[PDB]
Design an enzyme around this catalytic site. Sequence first.
Site, mmCIF file in Angstrom:
data_model
loop_
_atom_site.group_PDB
_atom_site.id
_atom_site.type_symbol
_atom_site.label_atom_id
_atom_site.label_comp_id
_atom_site.label_asym_id
_atom_site.label_seq_id
_atom_site.Cartn_x
_atom_site.Cartn_y
_atom_site.Cartn_z
ATOM 1 N N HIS A 16 1.391 -1.287 -0.090
ATOM 2 C CA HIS A 16 0.033 0.217 0.213
ATOM 3 C C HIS A 16 0.707 1.615 -0.284
ATOM 4 C CE1 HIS A 16 -2.146 3.025 2.051
ATOM 5 N NE2 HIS A 16 -2.916 2.548 1.145
ATOM 6 N N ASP A 18 1.355 4.325 1.271
ATOM 7 C CA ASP A 18 1.874 4.884 2.533
ATOM 8 C C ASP A 18 2.425 4.045 3.134
ATOM 9 O OD1 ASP A 18 -0.175 6.968 2.094
ATOM 10 O OD2 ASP A 18 -1.932 6.283 2.984
ATOM 11 N N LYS A 19 2.104 3.003 3.398
ATOM 12 C CA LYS A 19 2.908 1.314 3.732
ATOM 13 C C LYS A 19 3.857 1.812 3.599
ATOM 14 C CE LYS A 19 1.445 0.820 8.330
ATOM 15 N NZ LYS A 19 2.430 1.083 8.672
ATOM 16 N N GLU A 44 10.793 11.362 6.510
ATOM 17 C CA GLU A 44 9.887 11.699 5.291
ATOM 18 C C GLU A 44 9.796 10.659 4.220
ATOM 19 O OE1 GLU A 44 7.750 11.646 7.913
ATOM 20 O OE2 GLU A 44 8.244 14.163 9.155
ATOM 21 N N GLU A 57 15.176 15.504 7.784
ATOM 22 C CA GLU A 57 16.445 16.228 9.374
ATOM 23 C C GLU A 57 16.998 14.668 9.608
ATOM 24 O OE1 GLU A 57 12.985 17.226 9.626
ATOM 25 O OE2 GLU A 57 12.854 18.489 8.474
ATOM 26 N N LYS A 168 -5.328 -3.464 0.821
ATOM 27 C CA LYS A 168 -6.701 -3.076 2.207
ATOM 28 C C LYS A 168 -7.502 -3.854 2.057
ATOM 29 C CE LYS A 168 -7.590 1.365 2.077
ATOM 30 N NZ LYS A 168 -8.176 2.874 2.081
ATOM 31 N N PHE A 237 -8.615 -3.364 -10.051
ATOM 32 C CA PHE A 237 -7.253 -3.348 -9.606
ATOM 33 C C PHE A 237 -6.169 -3.190 -10.278
ATOM 34 C CE2 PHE A 237 -6.349 -2.663 -4.600
ATOM 35 C CZ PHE A 237 -5.261 -1.131 -4.726
ATOM 36 N N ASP A 245 -1.839 5.913 -6.551
ATOM 37 C CA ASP A 245 -2.662 7.108 -4.990
ATOM 38 C C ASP A 245 -1.069 7.085 -4.512
ATOM 39 O OD1 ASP A 245 -4.187 7.868 -2.997
ATOM 40 O OD2 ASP A 245 -3.431 6.558 -1.854
ATOM 41 N N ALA A 246 -0.709 8.226 -4.197
ATOM 42 C CA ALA A 246 0.689 8.728 -3.768
ATOM 43 C C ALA A 246 0.875 8.842 -2.647
ATOM 44 C CB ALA A 246 0.156 10.701 -4.604
ATOM 45 N N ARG A 251 0.507 8.231 6.786
ATOM 46 C CA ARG A 251 -0.533 8.337 6.511
ATOM 47 C C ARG A 251 -1.877 6.917 7.260
ATOM 48 N NH1 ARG A 251 -2.031 12.468 3.274
ATOM 49 N NH2 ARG A 251 -3.341 11.730 2.331
ATOM 50 N N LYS A 252 -1.067 6.750 7.966
ATOM 51 C CA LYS A 252 -2.036 5.008 8.259
ATOM 52 C C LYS A 252 -1.701 5.130 9.181
ATOM 53 C CE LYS A 252 -3.810 3.641 4.923
ATOM 54 N NZ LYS A 252 -3.588 5.148 4.385
ATOM 55 N N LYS A 272 11.747 8.246 12.774
ATOM 56 C CA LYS A 272 11.692 8.868 13.980
ATOM 57 C C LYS A 272 12.571 7.986 14.952
ATOM 58 C CE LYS A 272 8.048 11.270 13.183
ATOM 59 N NZ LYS A 272 5.823 11.459 14.495
ATOM 60 N N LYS A 276 11.995 11.270 19.323
ATOM 61 C CA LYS A 276 10.525 11.613 18.708
ATOM 62 C C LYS A 276 9.711 11.894 19.680
ATOM 63 C CE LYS A 276 13.352 13.268 15.196
ATOM 64 N NZ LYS A 276 14.857 13.353 15.920
ATOM 65 N N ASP A 278 6.836 10.408 20.313
ATOM 66 C CA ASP A 278 5.609 11.067 19.393
ATOM 67 C C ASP A 278 5.545 9.052 18.913
ATOM 68 O OD1 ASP A 278 3.804 12.372 18.684
ATOM 69 O OD2 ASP A 278 5.283 13.062 16.096
HETATM 70 C C1 LIG Z 1 10.232 18.979 16.978
HETATM 71 S S1 LIG Z 1 9.421 19.619 14.714
HETATM 72 C C2 LIG Z 1 9.910 17.741 14.418
HETATM 73 C C3 LIG Z 1 10.996 17.064 14.886
HETATM 74 C C4 LIG Z 1 12.388 17.246 14.479
HETATM 75 N N1 LIG Z 1 11.821 16.535 12.716
HETATM 76 C C5 LIG Z 1 13.828 16.977 14.677
HETATM 77 O O1 LIG Z 1 14.158 17.266 13.040
HETATM 78 O O2 LIG Z 1 13.602 17.053 14.910
HETATM 79 C C6 LIG Z 1 8.176 19.109 15.342
HETATM 80 C C7 LIG Z 1 6.903 20.552 14.991
HETATM 81 O O3 LIG Z 1 8.301 21.506 16.224
HETATM 82 C C8 LIG Z 1 8.057 22.559 16.341
HETATM 83 N N2 LIG Z 1 9.326 23.330 15.826
HETATM 84 C C9 LIG Z 1 10.714 23.686 15.310
HETATM 85 N N3 LIG Z 1 11.708 24.265 15.863
HETATM 86 C C10 LIG Z 1 11.556 24.632 17.016
HETATM 87 C C11 LIG Z 1 11.960 24.847 17.839
HETATM 88 N N4 LIG Z 1 13.415 24.787 17.916
HETATM 89 N N5 LIG Z 1 11.128 24.733 18.906
HETATM 90 C C12 LIG Z 1 10.101 24.395 19.290
HETATM 91 N N6 LIG Z 1 9.016 23.940 18.566
HETATM 92 C C13 LIG Z 1 9.899 23.583 17.371
HETATM 93 C C14 LIG Z 1 7.839 23.530 14.612
HETATM 94 O O4 LIG Z 1 6.390 23.296 14.013
HETATM 95 C C15 LIG Z 1 7.709 21.391 13.993
HETATM 96 O O5 LIG Z 1 7.304 21.492 12.473
HETATM 97 C C1 LIG Z 2 -8.956 4.784 -2.914
HETATM 98 S S1 LIG Z 2 -7.263 5.130 -2.917
HETATM 99 C C2 LIG Z 2 -7.371 6.607 -2.633
HETATM 100 C C3 LIG Z 2 -7.915 7.615 -3.896
HETATM 101 C C4 LIG Z 2 -7.284 8.104 -4.929
HETATM 102 N N1 LIG Z 2 -6.222 9.064 -4.774
HETATM 103 C C5 LIG Z 2 -8.110 8.558 -5.491
HETATM 104 O O1 LIG Z 2 -7.036 9.395 -7.038
HETATM 105 O O2 LIG Z 2 -9.300 8.144 -5.581
HETATM 106 C C6 LIG Z 2 -5.973 4.965 -1.395
HETATM 107 C C7 LIG Z 2 -5.944 3.140 -1.067
HETATM 108 O O3 LIG Z 2 -7.491 2.417 -2.139
HETATM 109 C C8 LIG Z 2 -6.720 1.508 -3.366
HETATM 110 N N2 LIG Z 2 -6.710 1.282 -4.496
HETATM 111 C C9 LIG Z 2 -6.036 1.691 -5.518
HETATM 112 N N3 LIG Z 2 -6.713 1.817 -6.515
HETATM 113 C C10 LIG Z 2 -7.757 1.077 -6.246
HETATM 114 C C11 LIG Z 2 -8.707 -0.355 -7.180
HETATM 115 N N4 LIG Z 2 -8.872 0.278 -7.688
HETATM 116 N N5 LIG Z 2 -9.812 -0.541 -6.076
HETATM 117 C C12 LIG Z 2 -9.955 -0.914 -5.319
HETATM 118 N N6 LIG Z 2 -8.964 -0.015 -4.336
HETATM 119 C C13 LIG Z 2 -7.891 0.959 -4.994
HETATM 120 C C14 LIG Z 2 -4.974 1.613 -3.242
HETATM 121 O O4 LIG Z 2 -4.113 0.365 -1.495
HETATM 122 C C15 LIG Z 2 -4.896 2.862 -2.566
HETATM 123 O O5 LIG Z 2 -3.304 3.434 -1.978
#
Ligand SMILES: C[S@@+](CC[C@H](N)C(=O)[O-])C[C@H]1O[C@@H](n2cnc3c(N)ncnc32)[C@H](O)[C@@H]1O
Ligand SMILES: C[S@@+](CC[C@H](N)C(=O)[O-])C[C@H]1O[C@@H](n2cnc3c(N)ncnc32)[C@H](O)[C@@H]1O
Lengths: 382, 382
Positions: A16, A18-19, A44, A57, A168, A237, A245-246, A251-252, A272, A276, A278
């Site tokens: 998938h 996102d996965k 990311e 980063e 899915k 499919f 699908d991007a 996102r999961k 991460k 982090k 999270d």
């Molecule tokens: C802390 S960052 C996520 C971790 C980061 N990707 C890293 O490389 O450690 C998440 C959010 O915190 C905020 N952030 C960024 N720099 C920060 C800083 N120096 N102090 C506090 N919050 C910050 C921003 O809103 C950012 O999108």
């Molecule tokens: C339905 S798509 C999201 C909507 C899509 N971005 C669009 O342009 O409509 C989400 C997920 O559904 C699955 N998918 C993609 N094509 C599909 C299809 N033809 N039938 C069923 N599921 C599908 C894939 O796992 C995909 O990442």
Amino acid sequence: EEGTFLFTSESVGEGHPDKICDQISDAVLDAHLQQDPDAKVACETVAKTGMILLAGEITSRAAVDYQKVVREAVKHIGYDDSSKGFDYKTCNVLVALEQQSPDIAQGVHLDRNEEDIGAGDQGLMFGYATDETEECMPLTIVLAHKLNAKLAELRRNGTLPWLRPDSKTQVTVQYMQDRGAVLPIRVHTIVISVQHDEEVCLDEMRDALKEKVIKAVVPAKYLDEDTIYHLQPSGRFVIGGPQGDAGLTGRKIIVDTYGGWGAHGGGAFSGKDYTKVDRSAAYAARWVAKSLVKGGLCRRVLVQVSYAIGVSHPLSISIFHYGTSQKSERELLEIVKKNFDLRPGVIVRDLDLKKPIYQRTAAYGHFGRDSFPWEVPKKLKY
Amino acid sequence: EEGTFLFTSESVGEGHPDKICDQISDAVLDAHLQQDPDAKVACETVAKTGMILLAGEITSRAAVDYQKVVREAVKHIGYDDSSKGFDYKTCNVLVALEQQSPDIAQGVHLDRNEEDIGAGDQGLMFGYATDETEECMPLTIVLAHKLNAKLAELRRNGTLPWLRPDSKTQVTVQYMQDRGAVLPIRVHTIVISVQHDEEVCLDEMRDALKEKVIKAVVPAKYLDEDTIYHLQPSGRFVIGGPQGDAGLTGRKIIVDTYGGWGAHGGGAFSGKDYTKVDRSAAYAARWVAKSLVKGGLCRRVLVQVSYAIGVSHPLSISIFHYGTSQKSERELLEIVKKNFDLRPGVIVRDLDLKKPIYQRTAAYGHFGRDSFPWEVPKKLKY
Ligand SMILES: C[S@@+](CC[C@H](N)C(=O)[O-])C[C@H]1O[C@@H](n2cnc3c(N)ncnc32)[C@H](O)[C@@H]1O
Ligand SMILES: C[S@@+](CC[C@H](N)C(=O)[O-])C[C@H]1O[C@@H](n2cnc3c(N)ncnc32)[C@H](O)[C@@H]1O
Ligand SMILES: Cc1ccc(-n2c(=O)c(-c3ccc4nn(C)cc4c3)cc3n[nH]c(C4CC4)c32)cn1
Ligand SMILES: Cc1ccc(-n2c(=O)c(-c3ccc4nn(C)cc4c3)cc3n[nH]c(C4CC4)c32)cn1
């Protein structure tokens, strides 16, 4: 029936889009941790037709070949030919990775004792556990994950060679209420959508999905004449993976956790390092919840924690036992205070979070599998 | 005190990098809907230093200038100079947008009566409402959103010219349990982190955040001698926006909804047209929940719905009233069945979801503000 309700959860396969991103983000994290256990990673991944982009980063002493790491992860997933819509050998790998912001570094970990490192961000996180399964996970999400794993197994062993990696699944279970705890009664609805080749027909796919996938995963005691099956409900499919699908990392997050049960604070896990919260605090909160259930204090429990960037101790801790404990939630908080230290610099030690096992967590859920450290309950003293 | 508990929620500002992506994704959606009300849009945005990348799928009769739409959204946010870390005039805008997969199109909407269009994907979604505020939202998240809005207001009016667009806030409230409903007692902890210029010192920022931001938003009755303040807790936040942290669309789904209360199915809202039930069914579920509370049936309620791709009717509907209704959850389901039609092709009509108002939803939460159609309760018949 009175006292019953429906609940639905979903899962997705390794291919998938996102996965794919979660797995690549974690393959990058593991590659760094293999050489530098203290790597600061925030990777990311974005996937679209013919493209893997890494953005984020990383500050690390490791020398990582991103082209090799990304392509090897895509190869493992199974995207190895243009006929499948994506190919690790020939896709574009783009890198937009910079060092960690020095302002974040100075506020979180620079010149700090490891146990006293600050949380890498603010945020809220939840842990959940339910005694409805041995692994302390909701049956809806366990079944949904197993259905995707079965599809990958039959694809990889050549049983159903028309299968492709993108899939899915979704499972609706009817539950009985039991004094705050829940008891699965039956499977009400199953959905399965999976990418396939141009030659296989819809009837062959639907028959295989019922006989070789559903029947091989879901106990017959949960399936009856009223169970609804939506198998290949779109009808076609062939286009799939990033081409269809991007995808993006994180996102999961509900598939990664409890399938809608418990609660979620919004943070993504993949890509991460331990600083982090999270990821680390959500793993520690699962560990706490599972320890309370396996320790016989609760049948079902939710734990919330929260942090501020640069501050080590959680700002708040809350426990909700759904009416399944004889102990009050004040008593459970005291037990948690006496038994756990939820500073990220202590969670790293308890859960061994510098180990490069993160790609293994990035499909089929981060919880209820494989006895990762957060799945081994702590014996509680009280 | 016995019967009380803590709960924490967060929010982020318009210039938080994930939120930048949500706003750009929705500016692209609105640009398409202004010319083609039936545009099929699935626009993801990625932001990192000097880069906005659009990735996804759009099938539309509109002629959209992506360079102009993206840069205008970034200008509105306030990133207009390299000194701020990001500039709409000079950043890179990259586009990787293709048509919607014909396999998805044929299975969802091609040759289908509008009311009978299939769900654009499978998935689960939740709606939630709580009578603790007039707008039927949790106080934790309302306060967190208002703190970010106040920062933007003081930045834009020149009161605190050292402020930059990237911000995060977090609010912990102590609640009293009230027969399933919740009553806010006091604010336990507030966190505020906001990007700033190189000249302002930490003490000036902390004083301004307490006196001009917190005191201007949070009623004094909730603040006391024990309230904990973490203001600029990292100590320095000059680097910010995409330069400090890569952003992606759909990475603030808990900020977009209930701040951790209720439940979440995992779907992101921004960049998607009505056929994507991740957005339309979540808006309809909020509408149902708010209608049950404003109609006097519940004080607090959670609604789950789920779908299969290509199928119009929801697969499951569940209602949990937390013990706050005299009606059973079977009775509430019957009331919902008699009053709402949760097919996406009917939700579009009830909630006017072809209107280009989506960029307005992409910061400060999608719920509890501005009397959008899903916030105007339906008068229930029973
Ligand atoms: C802390 S960052 C996520 C971790 C980061 N990707 C890293 O490389 O450690 C998440 C959010 O915190 C905020 N952030 C960024 N720099 C920060 C800083 N120096 N102090 C506090 N919050 C910050 C921003 O809103 C950012 O999108
Ligand atoms: C339905 S798509 C999201 C909507 C899509 N971005 C669009 O342009 O409509 C989400 C997920 O559904 C699955 N998918 C993609 N094509 C599909 C299809 N033809 N039938 C069923 N599921 C599908 C894939 O796992 C995909 O990442
Ligand atoms: C996040 C979340 C998950 C599940 C639920 N959920 C439930 O927890 C119970 C439940 C479970 C056990 C019980 N024991 N007793 C004595 C009463 C009970 C009620 C009933 C129920 N119906 N719809 C839902 C939600 C889908 C909307 C429910 C609520 N919130
Ligand atoms: C998603 C979610 C949100 C909130 C809560 N939550 C709660 O809803 C109640 C609560 C509210 C009202 C009540 N009325 N009565 C008679 C008993 C009640 C208990 C107590 C409680 N403590 N920690 C939590 C969670 C943070 C972990 C709680 C649970 N789940």
